[model samples]
Target chain A: SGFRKMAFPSGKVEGCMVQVTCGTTTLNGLWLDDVVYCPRHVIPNYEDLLIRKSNHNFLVQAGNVQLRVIGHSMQNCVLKLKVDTANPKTPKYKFVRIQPGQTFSVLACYNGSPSGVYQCAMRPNFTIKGSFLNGSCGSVGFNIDYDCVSFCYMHHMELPTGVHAGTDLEGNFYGPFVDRQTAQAAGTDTTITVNVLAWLYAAVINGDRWFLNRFTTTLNDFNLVAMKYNYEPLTQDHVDILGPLSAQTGIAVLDMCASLKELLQNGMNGRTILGSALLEDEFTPFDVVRQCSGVTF
Target chain B: SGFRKMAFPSGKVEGCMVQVTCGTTTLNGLWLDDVVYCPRHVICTSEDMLNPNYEDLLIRKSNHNFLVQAGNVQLRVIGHSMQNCVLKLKVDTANPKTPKYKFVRIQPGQTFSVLACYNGSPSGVYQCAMRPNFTIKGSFLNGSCGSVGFNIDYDCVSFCYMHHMELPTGVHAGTDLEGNFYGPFVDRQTAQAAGTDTTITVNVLAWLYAAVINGDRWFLNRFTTTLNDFNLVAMKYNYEPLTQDHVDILGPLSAQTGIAVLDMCASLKELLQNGMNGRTILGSALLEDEFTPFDVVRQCSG
Candidate 1:
């Protein structure tokens, strides 16, 4: 019997990796051979999503580990972060409603010193909540070790400290502007961190036509204004034709999140998403990000 | 009793201030007892608007009563070079058998029928319009004939009236190279029927009464199109204190905090259209039409 297999109906499943499916909707989760965790990536999908079993739902079992998957849309999946393994009686599952850009804590310390913060996909804010039984915490309390940082920079300058960075409705990522005064006041420790989950959410989930259309409308207006006034219009042919699909190859190949994060850490914000390769001449990555975001100098 | 007076249905003898009428229609003019105004102020008409009725067309008598005779010639009496007046024709029905027409003394410009005969096709009726020309702010009579062969003199004499009534007159039609139509239309019907590819340019001065009507989707759609060639320019229309939805589309042209600038102008309908395909153009100074109390002018182009 292989260590990884698809389980349907129900039998003695021989695998450390199990996937459950109904129709075409399949949910895959991994199980370590002899390791039981507050299973960090354990999320369950169900209608009403509480603790009830219904038809067309599959329960994936790998040893003592069990997970639920509903084979249809309509209901949302709940993120289950095992909160209290210190209790010898029953392992407690923390049911958190999955939201875009949501950041929650996974209980890593036995006595809740400071658990790690994890963000949901595509959203841009980090929120820390107590995963302890009674909002319990150690002497250190809750501390999120995140530096307020941005990924893109202009020339050698970083985004000004305390400035905000966000993706507009047009899908163009805007980094905060850097000024000499704020950059110096933030001191040397001010840095940038790339939440990989945000990019994946933007690239895979929210990156559909609904998000793509905003980009087209924004770009179309920009080009119209430019052409009307005799200014240089940016090239949007590739973006118009390919949509978000064109940004993915670069998002994936170049590890844009990492570069953007590093760029922000170094205090420079005029960077491109994938590279300037797919874009035409006279059109840089900064132009795509700038015009689409309405970033003026 | 003096000759003419404001006459009612009963022919009770009145003064020299007669108004002739048949049914609801009345023709009023001055009749001097011994003074002839060409009978200069004697522009009169009958049911046919020219001549046919004997009683409806009254002759104002002067000392030399046999002064005029019948002929086929149409005469134009220019009151003064500085004066603006519409030339209206009333037949000289003194010879009832064959009616000859003469231009009476001028009055303030008014819209009425100008006399024209298509070689003798007297039945072909057309209207003469005296509308103010916006560029010069002067009134002129415009007449059109269905075909040629009409013995009609198309001329307008401009004049000033002691008691002038203010009227708005907008007229212009320009077709761009890209088959785009621009116009200064009178009402919604003509404005909307401009063309398949049309852009109705509105001057806030003239269409001030269309305050709230400008926000209507149908009214806005005519002024805006996605194509660049149909770029419509709105004169003296300002989009200020931008509406909530328009902030994003005008974001580039806006301040850092998103309030749009003064020079930038755009249609609120273009931004708020059902689909994303609607667009707006930019150029020209955008000013507020003072008649608009609030900034609800959603249908503007720059």
Candidate 2:
């Protein structure tokens, strides 16, 4: 406690230096505006960032700062994509189990980490549509945070200066949205119609708001966030409001609870997570009394 | 706790000291061979015990040493010589000016017990008649508890009422075809033991007695035998196996004993409808006989 100065600045874990488990490397600090740089030759191929490629593993660049995107970490291994720059992007993030058989590649920058090449990008605004769950499900909830969550995806973006300085990466989301289908279309070698995701909620998010709200509560600032879920049932006032509205449309005034996940990707059914119960189809509200369902691995 | 001592060497309640509720009256108690004397003349105790010996007969040694005192009953106790017995219960002709009188009887025996008429008196008559080759202990009929070798008065009287009275030999038989007698019983006295595996069955019991309460005997019998037959819980107190577990076992237990069968044509007829008995009949009884035979019978009735 007596050693370091301003150890945790305003709760920022970014400035803290740490060693990775593999111990193969130690990262440099400070994310910058010039170019996504590294001292000497940490990322052996530092010459690749001089210009942009139509398709490259090095996701985006801003002056000397770079945000490298690693698709998925398939192995049950832990490793960090160390940011060896005085740029602002935080250094070393631990990642585990993204998907099975994800490809890993090491990209190189152009010259010294001075100026980066091409485009500032915008994260596509996630479109949310509610459908009457066939039996019962689906609803409105989490916002796209308007302000993005990760260093790579900011809620909103801007271009500070250059010849095309005022150029906003505000074009239909960089290139195209890499939805699960797009990625699946480009999924594997010797592919069959065996795989295809309906649509992906993309990248990532703080799925459980209540979960995140608790940790931040110590600051005495998250009270409202905490009260979000604790909000009481619809008042008679609300009931009165929706009462006539129901007659005007086919909608029901009945409210439902969404056992939801903050982020969406592949398969994650609440039933699978909950477990099973047998049914008695012949009685009560049963049909042949279908068999009891709900099992997951 | 209620009664203290009595006259039967077995300490029967006949000439026992029984306390009536609210200071009503105390009747002379020595169930028999003694007069039922009442001081205030309130009880209906000895309507059966009176006599016209109005001043008749005398008391000799152990000569039915009954007939002696007024109400306010108590005990006479004894010492080592053992010569003294107990209170004498004498009977008398009903008189006009006499609202009541005293009666007592003293017997010579060491067993000081009571019918506990207040505790348990096999007073009411029952109809769990008989079944062939059915010995007393064979079924739930525990007449054995009070029969031949045990306390004869109370226990024996609680014994099942069965008779081996033979029917005309031709039609009076079962098809067991294996033993000296797989068919009918020999005779009441001769049919000593109910042979092995020889099933025991009884006649339908009176509903009032199907559960245990003060006024009925069989109810007390069944209630004591197995609590599964009734729910002391959540009202609707009667002989309805209170839970699934109760229904499971009692259904079969009743089948052998024969009384659990629904007698009233209106199978679901709720009777003696005292919506009381607030104790819990949680599990182990009649209600949830979903996949059981009780279920069949219940649905069949529908």
Candidate 3:
């Protein structure tokens, strides 16, 4: 009776547990990298509800791609998809119903044209509207394709030749290693892979090697904090790994950021373009911790 | 100037090391917690001089404390009263390369006191080992002689026996300066609401419990509160809200807790006596005073 729903049996979400009260019972379960795990003990009928308290904002690239939103939930779980159009007057939307313990995926595409050819030029917008278990309603931006021209701008010096070609005309930033062409050819999916590899290098070269292992598992299971731009504030996981203790305000965070950036700067064999620009970017998680540490208010 | 610096003649800085480069010589030496231990072979002579780069930050706390830093080497203690046994060292004249050592025995319920002092040439190293049916305490050594190497051993029961008792019939366990009741609670809701700050009451209760752990009759009398009342109040509040943001607070708190203090004395005694050093005290109401009874949560002990 609600919106059309799909099930993805194999879909899984990274584990970020948030304590939530479902009806009378309180359940502490997970979030991010998509799959929401609703514990069977609390709400037995629908055991995999990925509930969000607020709207999830993401800067997806513009391209020939379909936004695949996967996961299931308890009854009355509705997700509304919205894609912002060139003309604000006309937008694309789709409503979905998320069911229990099912791996459901939806390839959402919006062209705003009669033929529905997802144009790769203009910056397309996406929104997944859903209500939390607490009955709060909000929308998440479209899951953008990494190959979009905008994705490169979010992380490195994106020149015509490649991401790590030379320098920008305004001289704001430069990429000396990563091949913009190669990244584009493989699509923007490799951005996260590159970022993870660089971070792994930093972890292995110094400090604890187990950090590398835990990071890899977490990253694989839940896609959090490693995206191009959209980064949530530091969660408990980040605190355990890099939280600065005592008087030091995120010094360990800075050390890691500095290390990761330097590796990128040294041209991690075409892994990235401008390490400094990428890390110093306001959207980076490291920058978020740095900002919180020095907050005047 | 033969390897001019602090040398650890014992060849072990608590069995931990990190590599360091000083002048043309580079060897893994000691740091504070991550002590970079330099080998005796690479550099000797003025060894244990404790180069500017490194100094052993092992601070020993006890009833009678002694911190002796000769060159880079350090010696300290653990016990109830330092006025029990006697500390006197004799040089082994027979074996030129022999080690200088001291041994003492403490009878049950006696004050274990020792004022160890040495004045000799840099010929022999030193070690002290002792045992008693009861307890021990005192400044270990102020030896102005021999090599910058020494070991001290003494023994004490790791677990202190505790029993619950009723508060005196009609008196109330008073208040803070304010009229509020004094409590060291484990409040879950408060913990979740306040995160790391919940350690406040936890610390208060810890200090109160310290009175009993140290067997301080004065402390118990001054507070005018039974240990069991504190135990009841403490057991009521759940200390489960500890997060990474404030785990550091728990670290220093635990290092100075009652059980750790007892363990330090007991372990020091055992180590000095060449006893098997693998005894790990498990969690129980006795070890509870040292705090954080749940082993599920791991925090830094330094």
Give Cα-based local distance difference scores for all models: 0.22, 0.19, 0.22
| Model 3 CA deviation exceeding 4 Å by range | A1-15, A19-21, A24-26, A44-70, A73-297, B1-285, B292-302
Can you tell me the CAPRI class of model 3?
incorrect
RMSD per model, one decimal: 33.6, 39.5, 29.7
For model 1, what is the error of residue B254's alpha carbon versus the real structure, in angstroms, after optimal superposition? 11
Q: After best superposition, candidate 1 residue A170: deviation in angstroms? A: 60
The Cα RMSD of model 3 versus the native structure comes to 29.7
DockQ for every model comes to: 0.00, 0.00, 0.00
The DockQ of predicted model 3 stands at 0.00
Model 1 residue runs over 4 Å out of place are A1-297, B1-43, B46-264, B269-302
- Assess every candidate by TM-score: 0.15, 0.14, 0.17
* Cα lDDT of model 1 by residue, B1-302, tens digit: 00000001100000111222223332221112221121111223323332322233333322222222112332222221111111122323222221122332221112222111111111111122122221111111111111111111211211111111112222222111111222332211222222222111222211221222222222233242332222322211221222233324333323322322222223333332232232211100121121111111211211
Summarize candidate 3's per-residue lDDT along A6-78 as a digit string, tens digits. 1110001101222333345443322223332222323212223335312222111122322232333332222
Question: Which ten residues in a row are the worst by lDDT in model 1 chain A?
Answer: A1-10
Model 1: how far residue A149 lies from native, Å? 73
